[PDB]
Amino acid sequence: SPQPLEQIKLSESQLSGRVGMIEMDLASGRTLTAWRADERFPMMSTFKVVLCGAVLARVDAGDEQLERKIHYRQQDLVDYSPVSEKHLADGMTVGELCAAAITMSDNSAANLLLATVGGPAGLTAFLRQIGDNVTRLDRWATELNEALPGDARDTTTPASMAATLRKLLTSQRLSARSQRQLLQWMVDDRVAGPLIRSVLPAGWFIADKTGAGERGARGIVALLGPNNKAERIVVIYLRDTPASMAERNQQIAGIGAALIEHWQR
Ligand SMILES: OC[C@H]1O[C@H](O[C@H]2[C@H](O)[C@@H](O)[C@H](OCCCCCCC3CCCCC3)O[C@@H]2CO)[C@H](O)[C@@H](O)[C@@H]1O
């Protein structure tokens, strides 16, 4: 593979889309690669990580419990509810809802949690509280992936999302237990985690959340590093490409290959 920045450029040429990317040291915040890092991209389902950061903040404050059982109804369900559709009779805990949202991309779970933090406006207020003045959520889980040209709703930037993830995971805004929980949810992603491990060389750590939307939108927030360590945050978003899902996945993977082959920078 070529150098990361050359590979990112090649991905734009091949996809005819915009790529946004940051590579950042998790422990320090050192930015290593940046590309379109202040441009806006739809978050898609990557928002579910920040959502559960907001939930954990409420837990830390004594305003929520991960144990608390929420008993919802079939009319509450939205498209793609692989876990939540199974628990109409018995409900799910707040922690189970976060696990379903992050590890399975369960949309009803996400919406149930989103209302607990005050909806899109409440999650946006939480982002402002932690010093992210850019990321914004405007819609609910099944409408926020529309990725209309020119539409600022439901967007982040690579730089903002990376900084926000670092804040949630490491800055002691969340309690130690909550930081550990958020990280474990990402480690446990079932949608892409096992597939990524299947193509990573031995020794490379992965934790992640992916997203997909219209007009080719695709993204991943991840922790990656050699020696089985979460050394770096990597955030990659794609927008405005007509390419197949397979090709969008392959281009993201190719950026990953470039980082892996050329890690010491
Ligand atoms: O010299 C480094 C390595 O180079 C190759 O590894 C290949 C690997 O066989 C392939 O499957 C992967 O594809 C990349 C798959 C990446 C998956 C997604 C990455 C994510 C992670 C972070 C968020 C953005 C994207 O490339 C690497 C690097 O060339 C060799 O196979 C391996 O034995 C050697 O250790």
Numbering used by the authors: 26 to 238, 240 to 252, 254 to 292
What does the paper say about this structure?
Bacteria harboring β-lactamase enzymes [E.C. 3.5.2.6] pose a significant threat to public health. These enzymes prevent β-lactam antibiotics from reaching their intended target, the penicillin binding proteins (PBPs). Sulbactam, tazobactam and clavulanic acid are mechanism-based inactivators as they share similarities with the β-lactam structure, the normal substrate for β-lactamases. Similar to a substrate, these inhibitors can, after acylation at catalytic residue S70, undergo several inhibitory reaction pathways including fragmentation in the active site and covalently cross-linking at S130.
Lastly, we changed the position of the ester bond, shortening the tail, and replaced the terminal carboxylate group with an amine group to result in PSR-3-226. PSR-3-226 was also not able to be trapped in the wt SHV-β-lactamase; we suspect that the tail of PSR-3-226 is not capable of forming a trans-enamine stabilizing U-shaped conformation. This prompted us to use the deacylation-deficient E166A variant of SHV-1 as we had done previously with difficult to capture compounds. Soaking E166A SHV-1 crystals for 30 minutes with PSR-3-226 yielded a 1.22Å resolution acyl-enzyme structure. Fo-Fc and 2Fo-Fc electron maps and subsequent crystallographic refinement indicated the presence of a covalently-bound partial PSR-3-226 fragment (refined at 100% occupancy) and a nearby HEPES buffer molecule fragment (refined at 80% occupancy). The PSR-3-226 inhibitor fragment, which consists of six atoms, was covalently bound to S70 in a trans-enamine conformation (torsion angle of 175°). Since only six atoms of the inhibitor fragment were able to be resolved, there were few hydrogen bonds observed in the active site; the inhibitor carbonyl oxygen occupied the oxyanion hole, as in SA2-13- and PSR-4-157-bound SHV-1, within hydrogen bonding distance of the mainchain nitrogens of residues A237 and S70. The one exception was residue 166, which was substituted to an alanine from glutamate to capture the inhibitor intermediate. This E166A change resulted in a local distortion of the main chain for this residue similar to what we observed previously for deacylation-deficient E166A inhibitor complexes. Interestingly, PSR-3-226 in both SHV-1 and KPC-2 is accompanied by a nearby buffer molecule interacting in the carboxyl binding pocket.
